[PDB]
């Protein structure tokens, strides 16, 4: 693609500049170019990839929710206003699905298959679950939900065998899988149980950590607690 002529290191450098400038679409394009060089990604590079696409899809998701709410209101004594709301919601939806397909394509060709260390493999499988979850949010679907579930479950199995309960990747995975259960899979009890168990097992391991690792882990634990407060 358009980044094929740029050095890998220059793409990474420009992704970091784009982040500082809050130019997340550019950041994502640079990171896609870096992945397509075919080398594995370091921890910092994986995080740049994730930040870029999370911000892009996050804006699309927020826009889709605004438009979907307007569309649902129009379908209630509501005056007919024509096809425009549906058309524009569909436009945003299609762009969102395209970004998710792009991310899933990078994971399948060939990030996941080359990822052997637990930290990288869990990271990518969590991403796979996340982007199928975003597809599920707009789908009208069973197979998409099962794809998200399967990716999260494989990531969970590796993380529980290979990572301590305070590891931030393990914690963020459990957080997002719990959101999947609550918001996608119609399984609030599973969501609550997973969040509780994850929080409690991390609590019991905090004593092993340095001050800086403690800060990293407790930040994500607080998100688990915030959700439990909302859900119970």
């Amino acid at each position: 693609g358009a980044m094929g002529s740029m050095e890998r290191a220059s793409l990474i450098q420009k992704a970091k500049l784009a982040e500082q400038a809050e130019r997340y679409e550019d950041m994502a394009a640079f990171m896609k170019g870096a992945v397509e060089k075919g080398e594995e990604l370091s921890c910092e590079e994986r995080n740049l990839l994730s930040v870029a696409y999370k911000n892009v899809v996050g804006g699309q998701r927020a826009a889709w929710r605004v438009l979907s709410s307007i569309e649902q209101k129009s379908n209630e004594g509501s005056e007919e206003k024509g096809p425009e709301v549906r058309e524009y919601r569909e436009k945003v939806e299609t762009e969102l699905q395209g970004v998710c397909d792009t991310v899933l394509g990078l994971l399948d060709s060939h990030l996941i298959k080359e990822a052997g260390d637990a930290e990288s493999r869990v990271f990518y499988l969590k991403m796979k679950g996340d982007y199928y979850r975003y597809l599920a949010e707009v789908a009208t679907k069973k197979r998409i939900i099962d794809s998200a579930r399967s990716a999260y479950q494989e990531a969970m199995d590796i993380s529980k065998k290979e990572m301590p309960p305070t590891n931030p990747i393990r914690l963020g995975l459990a957080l997002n899988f719990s959101v999947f259960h609550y918001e996608i899979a119609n399984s609030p009890e599973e969501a609550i149980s997973l969040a509780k168990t994850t929080f409690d097992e991390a609590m019991a391991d905090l004593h092993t950590l340095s001050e800086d690792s403690y800060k990293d882990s407790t930040l994500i634990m607080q998100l688990l607690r915030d959700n439990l407060t909302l859900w119970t």
Binding site: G172, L175, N176, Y182, L219, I220, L223, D226, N227, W231
Partner: peptide, 5 residues
């Protein structure tokens, strides 16, 4: 519901 950063 909050998801990961």
């Amino acid at each position: 519901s909050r998801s990961s950063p």
